[PDB]
Amino acid sequence: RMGTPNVSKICNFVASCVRNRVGRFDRAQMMNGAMSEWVDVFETSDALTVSIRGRWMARLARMNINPTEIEWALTECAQGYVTVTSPYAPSVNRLM
Amino acid sequence: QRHITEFISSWQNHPIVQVSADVENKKTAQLLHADTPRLVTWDAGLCTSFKIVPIVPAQVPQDVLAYTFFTSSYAIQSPFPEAAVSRIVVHTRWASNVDFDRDSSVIMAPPTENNIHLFKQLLNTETLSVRGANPLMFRANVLHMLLEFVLDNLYLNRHTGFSQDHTPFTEGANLRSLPGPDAEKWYSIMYPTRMGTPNVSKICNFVASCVRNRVGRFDRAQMMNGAMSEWVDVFETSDALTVSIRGRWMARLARMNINPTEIEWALTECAQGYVTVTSPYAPSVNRLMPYRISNAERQISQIIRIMNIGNNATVIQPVLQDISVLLQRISPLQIDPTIISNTMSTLSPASSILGKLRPSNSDFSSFRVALAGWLYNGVVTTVIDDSSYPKDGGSVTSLENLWDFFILALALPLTTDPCAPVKAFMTLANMMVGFETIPMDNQIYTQSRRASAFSTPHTWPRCFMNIQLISPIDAPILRQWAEIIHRYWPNPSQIRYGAPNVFGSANLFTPPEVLLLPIDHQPANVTTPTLDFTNELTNWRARVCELMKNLVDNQRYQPGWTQSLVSSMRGTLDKLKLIKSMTPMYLQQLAPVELAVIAPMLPFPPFQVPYVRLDRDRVPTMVGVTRQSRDTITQPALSLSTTNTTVGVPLALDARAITVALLSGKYPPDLVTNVWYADAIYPMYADTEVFSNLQRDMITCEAVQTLVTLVAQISETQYPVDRYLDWIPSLRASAATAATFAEWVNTSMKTAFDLSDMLLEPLLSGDPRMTQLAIQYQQYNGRTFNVIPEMPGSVIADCVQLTAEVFNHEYNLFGIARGDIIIGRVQSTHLWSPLAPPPDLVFDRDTPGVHIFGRDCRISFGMNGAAPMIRDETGMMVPFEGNWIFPLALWQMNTRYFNQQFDAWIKTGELRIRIEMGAYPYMLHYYDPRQYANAWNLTSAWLEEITPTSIPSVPFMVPISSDHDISSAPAVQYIISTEYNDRSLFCTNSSSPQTIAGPDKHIPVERYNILTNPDAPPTQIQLPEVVDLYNVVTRYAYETPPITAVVMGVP
Amino acid sequence: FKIVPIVPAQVPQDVLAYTFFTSSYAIQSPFPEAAVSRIVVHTRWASN
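Output (structure tokens, whole complex):
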């Protein structure tokens, strides 16, 4: 995106760099006010920290549970002494 | 004529007419709700998009100034104004007259004026400067421009009457009369040959040379009214392209044309014989009723409808509400829960239930809503609040809980939920816990587990699945209930619907002519009695009452009762079981008849999937839809469809209200069903909008096919598509870029059809690169059904290809300049144009020593007496002079820097640089040759307008045309084009008799070939090279009857 | 990790031709432009 205005190795290197590998690579969304659960994009960054965050996400996903499951469990724990309730709708992506 | 729907009843002198709301007389009449474009139009004005503009008249010797008769003189008027130079100008339908406007007209400014707005009509609209357009967006803009021209030309020329002429040349000849004034000016344009040319001028010489026979009406339809025939052929100035496009549009209308007798039969079928339309009609010679359609178009449209719906509950609630209002006034049946209360004649269990009922509320929406949901079986789910069920699973001793159970049992068969029987069974088990024992196959699910948790078949218990597996001894009341449910479980029904010959049906997951129902229905009989155990609901109520009595008989479930309520409870239950409600009777006969009548009435076809009452394995789990072809693999993204996990939208309704209504139904005592229905239906049928919905759907289908073809045309795809204007500049647009351009096309189409409703919004929603639409659904056992429709071709695409080839032949006429230009100041007394200057003066591309410069080429600058020579791309440093070749893209990258380096060279430098342009829009300025001309300031301004993002249309300064020798003064111009693009000029200096040398332009014989050449046949064509400005044309008059029905009885 | 500039390039000089003077353009750069520059680890240096 920077203007070359130089024959610098950087300027030659930018011309060499692939034009198409730019912008969001992919996303889990399209609708307005419908956030992508995940999105892929080519950008300056370091692979190692991204990999670390991905493994962190994997462990969190391993512990994640669904809200309907939670409502049933809480109701059972209450034993009818108290009642907890959840409405019926598709997962909007809340980590549990 | 204001009425668009005309209905006359046979049993009443009360005709009912449906009209557009725009009319001033909606008195006691239905109106047309759907937003629909008027595709058919009649033209009261010339269908001309191009008008020549004459810069200065030229005439020489002239025989006569006015025709002489008695003391009066007929004036001589030239349809073509005289000019030293005359060029046509673009204003689509500039001479047309119509009540309806496409609002797609294109006006191109005259050559002295800038037409940049049309070139920038698409992506270049956002420019502060009037001039200037982005090059890589040019191809998209041109395609859209052609599209707008076609949409703007969607009209029919109304046939009009003719008149005998009294002008001497065609005295007694028949001239079609244009409306009111200018008709003689219009006559001169249609029949320039009629105009005499006593004066001598190139126009006059041409008129004198013209053939007398090629004028007036070529032919007329033998049938005619007064001076006007059904169709006619006449000789006049015209554009073949528009006529050809209209012919294709007319051909589509001809295929769509439908016949009235078929309509009468279809109307009778829709009425189901309740009402019948009459056609003892005098035939219309031009009667036109375009109602031919294919169910495949309907299927594509419904897939679009589902994507467009994007689960909008807000859209669904109103349709259901309007339908419920219709059912409320479409049903003569009266509901009287207070009558039930009086029959009861009422610590009281009856008092408890009465307080629970709270009958004061007068709203009955839920029952009608339930019927509507049954109609949309596939997309609708009926659900019940657990709170409707007894609190805490109810109490064996609770009388109020007993009331809840009875009401729940009554509405349980009603619920569309497939696992609802399982839930009711679980509910009974929950109340039975500690009295009867139910085994559970799964530890996770308990006997007291809330039934709503068991919302799916896989959670159906194996003990629940086999009654024999459960011990009858363990839960004998429960065992009996299971057997009774199997013995009396409700039966759903399927009823024939739709008319294939016209509307047909697009049903895929369901049979097209069959309508699915969750309730078995039987033939209506007016004499039928109130009591009917044969009715499934009545039998169910009776069985449930007896089962409850058996359960409460020992009072084991209700210990602690000092007094036996068994006798009282049995009496109340017996009265309830024997209640003479006609609501089940009404549902058995009246409800089916009403639903059958409304099915054609439904504006939106219901979505249903096959009903499997006991087929748990064959119960479908979900429905999948695809925008891509199966072979392609693409990212799945977040969508609206996710919001409804259930394919049927879940709906919860008030069970108490529905149960009370079911127990409280009575018809009017003297009511005649046929009479009541015919009376209500006749205005309602006069209110039909199905035709409008069908027309909108057909337009959407045509648009979709055209869109996919255009996407292949303007994008790189595997499918081969002809693009002859790839030379027109364009970058590789991202799918989103193409989609945004497509969205602009869609907004244009809606405005063109004046559409107030959203069009193809799901199509514009996203996933523009979708290879194929496909849909499938699967069963709990895992069996699946997949439906994929086949694309029907679009006339628009073929017309587009033809126009594209015409543009490629006529792009110079089109006003866009192909090729590049060379920068060189030149002052001379010769008239050579930038389009046609001396070639030697321009350095040709294949020339030695021309300089092209490398992007990183070493650059040297001199300051404070320093002198720099730029190292060349070849690597040899040279002075800033000579003939150079510069790529435009490099220039855009460094426009300011290049201008600064050559600014001295640009103003006074003899250095000549060629920037490769390939194609571009151009701007024309006329100038006076006898006064000094300097474009250097003008060139600087144009260069400053040139920008890295995009460049302005080239500004051209040209001299005023002259037919006579005139004095001249020096003129300085640095812009030199490499090719002649002056084909656009219609004529030059009509006055001059002959030219020894240099440019001279006359009226084109080929464009006036029929008039110019007698040998040429009238229908002979020179397309695409020559387009005749004046030609013989066909105008037809047709008459269209809109929806009209005469309602009567069946023979 | 963020690159840190160690040694910059040498400019300006009278002899140097300036149709070219790159420093005259002064465009912002993604990475440091210098005679010597080295990458450095700065965890969450741009993180918010």
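Chain A has three helices and two strands.
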